[PDB]
Amino acid sequence: DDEEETYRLWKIRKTIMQLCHDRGYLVTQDELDQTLEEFKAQFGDKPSEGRPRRTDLTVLVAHNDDPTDQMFVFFPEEPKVGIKTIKVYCQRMQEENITRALIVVQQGMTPSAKQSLVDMAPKYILEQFLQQELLINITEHELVPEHVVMTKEEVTELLARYKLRENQLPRIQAGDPVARYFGIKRGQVVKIIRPSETAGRYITYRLVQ
Template sequence: MDDRLYQIRKTILQMLSDRGYLVNPLELEQTKEEFKRSFAPDGQNISREAMTIFYVKKKDPTKQIYVFFPEDPKVGVKPIRKYVEMMKERQVARAIIVVQQNITAFAKQALNEFSQAKNIQLEQFNEAELLINITHHQLVPKHTLLAKEEKSELLQRYKMRESQLPRIQLNDPIARYFGLERGDVVKIVRPSETAGRYVTYRLVV
């Protein structure tokens, strides 16, 4: 279990770094032994609650994120309500909840209701999804989120509307990894035997 949680936390830290959050390089290089010393208070069992993460964006410190690791195998409404209260106290608008199993139907409904009513974003990942970093797979091309100005320049350059761009679904694993939102545009660079590289753009829908 230690190895599993170690890898999950490592993937989360890589994800946050790729999203532009200020992650200490030393944390990215943390060894399994260091991980256990940090998160196993009794020297034996890893405390998921102690693994809670808080980071800010490099370019905009007002954009902050929590990552929660609930202790309960199946998450209900109560821990979600507790996390929302923590977010309100620190005025944090975004969080990731890493669950061991699928959350209950009531908890899923609560996620949606809290997101709409509290003006926050709550993302959910299963631990199994984070055992490997999908962006490190050799068949996955490089994805880069365009800034708003870059998106406008792209549309002007090709004299097109955003609806004319190829699409990527909001629930696509890559879109979820980068925390993309509807209306975002990603630049995708693939290797090409003839041109060296092949560049495409996709609109998140």
């Protein structure tokens, strides 16, 4: 199909725009929610060997303050990504001076390339996402409450007010899909605002382990 592919590419584009905006980036307001027909006009209504192919829509966004760091998002052509495909993206990144990036894989990554992504983590950070993860912004789901990443000063304020350590907070996985959505690393407390039917509002905290 070709209309299904431009729908799927538009929904991945929409979810990546909402992901960058929720992560705290410069997302333009019309880009943050464009119409499918606007995407078809801007890109060309034929993903089957045509104008909205992959690598045309690699989204480069900067940060809302400190505009140096960028995570210019990747879309591989092939379904099953490998090392000799991601080293081209490594070449494009080392051509630049920026260390974060997101690739949007179609099928699963070869696990050697999964190990390879960890094999440059102090140098430059790479996250990966499957197509099914990005056809739905899971933060819009009603079961998912408001996750907010906390700054280090607020973490010091938290631990100094409650007189507890980072070992004692209730914790969260690093491969948690909301943690993967915000792209938080290990040791980075996430405040979570959720409505409670017995107090109104409850703010819990999840240190990342």
